[PDB]
Design a protein around this ligand. Structure first.
Ligand code: VN9
Ligand code: VN9
Ligand code: MG
Lengths: 153, 152
């Protein structure tokens, strides 16, 4: 592997480890990975971090009833750009009706960007991904990893 | 004021807001501010963040029973360099016997650096500072802010 490839895999591993912990504890989480469409306008609504990715920091951000847990983490250029960011709520009538604003925010940003958003449900610990206006629900660890690898390829 | 001075004031405001929040809730915390003696050896023992300072991130770091809460946060200027860092434990006999490892780690790093370390006690909520081998306990909000402003 090359340095860039090793860094991308390290980030994927850090994300999957954090998602796994939050799924087990049913910690709600919203993590958007910026791609070609710039999301500076949304990054600026949150608390600036520009931090190195780690599973530890991702977990610490989303602990319930803490300053940073409300809103989205947005990643950009292999860093955590900001936390507690606003994302637009989808008005799509085709999202499962049992899901709340976290999933609607993920779908909403995916309607106006090429980003990939990961959601952990606080009700079930289920893991889903929003891209292109669609929500892919009930993902296994292997399925999330495949989506992250496809996105970065 | 220069941009450097304004940035320093924002970082002091972030630190004091976080310390005040944690003291009221008995959230133990250990926060070392690097000065002219470089702390790279200790930064490298923790989880790298290299993050912009905010009161929110400082609070989130120290929440009990989380990955980042055990060990020291080390700050470099206006960044949180790393969390969950090792610091050496002082053997000074002038550390109150009831105090635990966070206070002994703070005095310990203060004996081999010119850093300023802030400690929040999870037992009492008391705020203390270690500097040059001495621990100063039970600081008021005003006293802590004045110490930080004097440190910059
Ligand atoms: O209030 C709280 C604090 C801690 C926590 C951890 C994991 C899931 C839910 C909670 N709720
Ligand atoms: O992406 C992921 C992360 C790990 C995980 C654990 C348990 C159920 C589903 C998942 N999916
Ligand atoms: Mg006194």
């Amino acid at each position: 592997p090359t340095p860039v490839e090793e860094a991308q895999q390290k980030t994927i591993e850090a994300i999957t480890k954090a998602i796994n912990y939050m799924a087990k504890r049913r910690i709600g989480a919203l993590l958007t990975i910026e791609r070609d469409t710039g999301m500076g306008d949304y990054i600026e609504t949150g608390i600036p971090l520009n931090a190195k990715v780690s599973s530890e920091l991702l977990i610490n951000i989303f602990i319930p009833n803490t300053p940073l847990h409300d809103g989205a983490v947005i990643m950009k250029n292999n860093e955590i750009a900001a936390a507690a960011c606003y994302l637009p709520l989808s008005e799509s009538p085709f999202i499962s009706k049992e899901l709340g604003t976290r999933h609607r925010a993920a779908v909403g940003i995916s309607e106006v960007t090429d980003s990939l958003t990961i959601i952990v449900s606080e009700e079930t610990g289920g893991v889903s991904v929003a891209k292109n206006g669609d929500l892919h629900r009930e993902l296994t660890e292997e399925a999330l990893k495949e989506m992250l690898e496809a996105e970065f390829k």
